[PDB]
A paper describes a structure:
Their genome of ∼14 kb consists of three dsRNA segments small (S), medium (M) and large (L), which are sequentially encapsidated as ssRNA precursors into the icosahedrally symmetric procapsid by the packaging NTPase P4 (15–23). NTP-binding sites are located on the external perimeter of the ring at the interfaces between adjacent subunits, whereas the nucleic acid binding sites are found in the central channel.
This suggests that in ɸ8 P4, extensive conformational changes occur as a consequence of nucleotide and/or oligonucleotide binding, which render the enzyme competent for catalysis. Nevertheless, the L1 loop contains a motif (LKK) that has been shown to be crucial for RNA binding. The first lysine of this motif (K185) is found in the equivalent position to K241 of ɸ12 P4 and is also seen interacting with D220 of loop L2. We therefore postulate that K185 (loop L1) in ɸ8 P4 plays the same role in RNA binding as K241 (loop L2) in ɸ12 P4, and that the coupling of the movement of the L1 and L2 loops to ATP hydrolysis via motion of helix 6, as proposed for ɸ12, may be a general feature of all P4 molecules.
Author numbering:
A (entry chain H), B (entry chain J), C (entry chain K), D (entry chain L), E (entry chain G), F (entry chain I): 12 to 184, 190 to 280, 289 to 300, 303 to 314
Amino acid sequence: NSIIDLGPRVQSLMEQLATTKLEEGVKNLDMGSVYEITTVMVLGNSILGFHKGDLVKMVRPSVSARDLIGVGYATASAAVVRQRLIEHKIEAGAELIISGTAGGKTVLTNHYAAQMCAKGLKVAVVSMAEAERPLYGSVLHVFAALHLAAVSDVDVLYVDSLRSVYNELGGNLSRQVDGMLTALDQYARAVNMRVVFTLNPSDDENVDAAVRSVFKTASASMHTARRIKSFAVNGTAFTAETEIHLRADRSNSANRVSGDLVSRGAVFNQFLLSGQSAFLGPNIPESN
Amino acid sequence: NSIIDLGPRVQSLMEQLATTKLEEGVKNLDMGSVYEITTVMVLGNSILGFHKGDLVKMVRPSVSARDLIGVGYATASAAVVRQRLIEHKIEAGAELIISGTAGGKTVLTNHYAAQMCAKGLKVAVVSMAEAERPLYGSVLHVFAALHLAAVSDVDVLYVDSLRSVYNELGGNLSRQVDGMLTALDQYARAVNMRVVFTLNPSDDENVDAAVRSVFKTASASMHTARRIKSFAVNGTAFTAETEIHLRADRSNSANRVSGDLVSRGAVFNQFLLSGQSAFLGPNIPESN
Amino acid sequence: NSIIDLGPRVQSLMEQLATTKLEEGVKNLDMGSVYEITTVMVLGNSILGFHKGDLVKMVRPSVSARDLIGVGYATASAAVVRQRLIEHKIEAGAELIISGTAGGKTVLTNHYAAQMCAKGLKVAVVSMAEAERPLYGSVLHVFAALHLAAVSDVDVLYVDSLRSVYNELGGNLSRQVDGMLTALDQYARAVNMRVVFTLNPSDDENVDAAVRSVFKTASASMHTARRIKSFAVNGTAFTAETEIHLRADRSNSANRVSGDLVSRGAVFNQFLLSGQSAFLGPNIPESN
Amino acid sequence: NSIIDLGPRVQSLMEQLATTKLEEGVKNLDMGSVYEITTVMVLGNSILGFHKGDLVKMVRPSVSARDLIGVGYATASAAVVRQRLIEHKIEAGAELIISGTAGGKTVLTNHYAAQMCAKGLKVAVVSMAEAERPLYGSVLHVFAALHLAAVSDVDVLYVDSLRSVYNELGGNLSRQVDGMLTALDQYARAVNMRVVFTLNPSDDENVDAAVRSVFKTASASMHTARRIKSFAVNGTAFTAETEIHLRADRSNSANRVSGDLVSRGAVFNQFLLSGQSAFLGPNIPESN
Amino acid sequence: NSIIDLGPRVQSLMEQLATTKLEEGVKNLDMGSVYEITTVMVLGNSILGFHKGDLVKMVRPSVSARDLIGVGYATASAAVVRQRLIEHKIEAGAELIISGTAGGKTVLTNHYAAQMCAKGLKVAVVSMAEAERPLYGSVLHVFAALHLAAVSDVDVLYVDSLRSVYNELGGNLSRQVDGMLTALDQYARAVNMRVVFTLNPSDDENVDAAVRSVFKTASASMHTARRIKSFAVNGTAFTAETEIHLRADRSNSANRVSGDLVSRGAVFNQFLLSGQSAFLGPNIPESN
Amino acid sequence: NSIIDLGPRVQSLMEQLATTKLEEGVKNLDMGSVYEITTVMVLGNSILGFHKGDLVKMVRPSVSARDLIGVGYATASAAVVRQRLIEHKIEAGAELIISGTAGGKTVLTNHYAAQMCAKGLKVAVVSMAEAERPLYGSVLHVFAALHLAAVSDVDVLYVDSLRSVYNELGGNLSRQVDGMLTALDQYARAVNMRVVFTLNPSDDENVDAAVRSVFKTASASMHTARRIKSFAVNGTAFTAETEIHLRADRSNSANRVSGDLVSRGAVFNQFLLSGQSAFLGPNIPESN
């Protein structure tokens, strides 16, 4: 039992979405058949629906997706059960590991992932919107990874990081940030998955002021809000002081955490050779 | 007799509006046949009309809906009578429960709803634009809920909250806020319903300064304006000092309030499998 | 002899303009046959012409209506005579009743209207852009009301208020405000009607500074400029100190005013049931 | 011999431009046959050409009119001679009568016009962008008046005022103002006409600071720049201290000026009754 | 031997570009056959190519011209030789005569032009973006003049001024200014011409601060950068202190300069009479 | 063995991309057959794919390229080996030579290139976004040069400079800068090439503050980050103090560096003569 990296699976899915008319849909996919989940997300004014491993199709409704459905949700029939989450008494929902100038956001994610993997849980980690990682970390990349994990036999998913999503919703210039964090927790509950998100507002002017106000938001919207107060590396080993919030505890708690340093094109080429290249027409490409 | 939650009914209606050409209309609906009401709202420059349980259709007039009709209204023939509102001497119109840093906006809404339900009134509550709630809380979601309650046997409707509507009209950067609050009260009178709205400008920079100026606006535009001055939780029990305005009293009144803590996908999947996906054409999707 | 309320007549006209292609025009109307007046207004870059009770049609000229015609005017053939205005020696033109923090804008309008009605004049009052009033108060709603009164046997028209028109032209962030106030006075003279407009820049940051600069503008552009300096309610009775300007008096005059408190869907449903719904095509809906 | 008012002639020409496809052109006009002049102006990215009394046609070039031709010019073949300007030794070119808080811009224009009319010159005056005047005063209205006077037997033209043109080019928030003032002087020379323009930046925040910088600009770009320093009315009579610049005098001169107070729909209706109403198509209406 | 003025030749070329579909091209031109040069410039996202006297055609590539080609260049086959530039040892490249509050930009240009004309060089001068001059001075007007001189027997070209080009690239609110100045020098070298440009940031808020930073930019990008430090007129005669930079001299040098005051529609009418007027279609007119 | 300049090869490729419909693609190219690499980049919402010497084709996906793929990557099958990089123990990846007010960015690039060329490596240098250089330096020009070097027998590529790319992503007004620097390093690793980038934020207001924050970013995202602290020229010879970062060294190191001063249209004309000119249609030209 080891941690599965969804990054390449998300990358190759983005390669397939770039080569076809999404209104017609991308059929004969193999995203996962373990759970019968349907992810519905907003891409600007368009809706992009991920059918449970069958298909991914886009719709352009007469009215904006922002008014109609907001951010995005997950629907499942008949049901979704994560037997191992019950076994290990791990509640479904979203967690936010947030750090400022102290850093150690990625280190702690790797620590908690390997720890969860050791306990017998099926752990998945997606790398995005950070240095040395190929995924740009867009809202589409988060929902693609979320769906890929949801429909598959994944119990705990680690999304590192939401840096691009935060910037995309103009978090560096917030209602939109709240709606996103609520939707991500709502999603994790509906899919009955434990999703652990990470964020460092390093693109923001006042990094630490953004950390406290985002942590206060995360505390209300998400199941767990974890703030890295301090972080120090000692060769292989690390140690970090953490502030943790669990809804609905009106009391916050300090939580020390230490351990060892745990470390983590065929589709497009095929298109280029065959002219199958205007599949948008009069509608401008949408972006969330 | 218990409180009915309109949230899922609004959610499934949004699912049907996202899957069809609204110019043609969404027919064979079952919104309600108790009252013969027609809701007419603005979505950008478009008009979205809710026929009384028959149908929901959109029009794209030659001139903007903003100039033509402004926000939105309700028309009814022949008449609308809420016998229980006369019985319990409850005047039709809109109420605004507004709070700042003190909070307790949701708690008081739940308190007043259960209290109204106990008196024998048909109470409906719609959850939106807040943490742990699926509805994003758009203007469309407010008018959808308003119509669903209007055409049904609902005497008192609780809309918690207008946080997204407030942000949508740029209340965080107001004439547009005034027009909305007036239209909502005008609607509640035309439909002969008691609609109780809630707001907390928590996305605003100066929260308490926004509370006083919105409360002053609400006092003129709506039947009742309720400002939560203070709020404290004592285990199960709560207590709050409230400032209340009733038009046209040139005198405001303090009003103490205490009690116990009262607590509150098939359509889209069917579309994804069948290519029925450009139903907008040359006109850009509208948003209010 | 009593005051006629044009509000519902304007509302039902807006209902007819929302349901048809205005390029083709709205025929078989009954706006009024007393005077042969034609109202020509600008809606963005489009021109909306009101024929004298026959018809209302829109044109989309090759060049902007803003360059071509500016705001709006009235043309009449052969002539327009208001016999009662001569009888009571009331000059045709526009008047602006403006107030700040003192208020009493609506009270004085009701006072002057009932007073004019008592003298034997045919008085019409249109309610817009204010609390408890259905009309949103757009530029289209002002010109609709102006034309409806113009073609009918109306001698004095009271437009309360221009709050939305002021905001529409960005008066809260002015050349556009000047052009509007001049056009409204020019209109009232061309139609040979006494139109009394009201304004309170309550949406403006510095309300009283806006009052003095708008009153100075009104003094030059309009026949009468009335500034409510003070206002106090004494049960039924009211009293207000007023500053009045008449062009071209280089001297202003104080004017005390006291008295008693005087108080003031079938078309759309028919459309919804019959698919007659894209009547704009490639041209975006215009807004002034 | 009296002063001719071009205002109504400009108004009725705007009525004809609003009712036809300008790409096809407005033929069988009678603007004037005295001189063989062609006015070429910019309306956004479009070019609107006035043939010498024959015709007015619009072109939509592949590239913007702003890059291609800038503001506007006049071309004439074979030649244009104003015999009376030689007789009375009046140089062709543009003059700018500018005033601030002192006012008396209109009074002096009326004084100089009647004075020029007395000397035997053919004087024309166009009223625009000011109170009690129907013309909105757009760039199109200036060039329409300029052409109508140019092709006719007019020696001196008074354009009161350029207030709207100044606001249109964003003079109240300048290169665009310079280009306009240079083009207007260049035009008057090419047409061999004496055009006297007037301006009061009363819509500007700091009125007097705008007066000095616009007067400094006018001094370089135009033949004569006249700044009204002071102005006072004494019943019928007036007196004003004036600063005058003539290029290329490196010395300015004071110039006292006193005297008496000198004072100054069928086409559209025909269209409304006959559906001749989309004549723009895919190109958005242009505005300068 | 005298100085040739390209202004009218540029003006009549702009008249031909405004009357045809540039995608088809403007054929049978007589721009010059002395040198086989092709000017390629950017007009927004479009590319406007000037073939060497044959033709001027525009292309609308799938991707923006800004990404593809940046500003503009010149290509020549087989070769371009200016025998007189070798004779008089004048290096090919661009020169920038820049002045602030001191002025004398035009005077020095006229002085250096007549001086170059006296030495036996073929001198051309184009007048633009300044008072008493018909050309508006756009980027298109600069490249039109550059090409007309390039293909003709011109050794030294004087472009007075780049005031409009500077404003066009938002120099008054810079990377875009740098790219333009580099492209103009690159052009002059490729065409083997001596082009002398002039600029006065008189539309800028802080004129002299803009002079020093533009002179520092010009020093790196162009062959010669000439800053007019002081300037004084003494009747006919003038004198000016100048700072001069030649790349790559670390050291700047002062350079005194004195002397005498040297002083400097058929196509469109033909179109108006013949309907040949939509030649753009769905693509919006481009502007640089 | 000498340094190859890719500038003209990039220039002639841009000439071919400007003359055809990129949706159809540009076939029969000879970019390089040494390595089987495919470059995939984003141009606004469009994707521009460079097949390994065969072809360059553009796609316009239903959803934005920014959400789908972010910046750009390289895919290669079966494999890419740079035997000389192993021989000389030079790791594949991106390097950033950054300087502020000290300069000497170009001098050091020329020094390191000639040094690498002496060691036996195949060195390529592309000149862009700087004075005396024809390439404007856009994102397209960087990826064009990157691909041309990648598919060819190039071991070390010097891109001088990223000044335009930095401005293009709004670095002078950052998440977008981070994503670009990460993608460029990711690219260099995937292609197994040593790419050395250069930057001087000379268009930025505070040049040196931008240098420290970009160097801190480069330190995390790229293999090597080189900051020029000081630089002085002594005739032929130069000397510079440098701060160098190698990931993942938590210690920075000073590094002195001295040496001698080392110094560095047919396709378009063919198009102009033959009308092959609307190849975009309804989709607006994209720009990154």
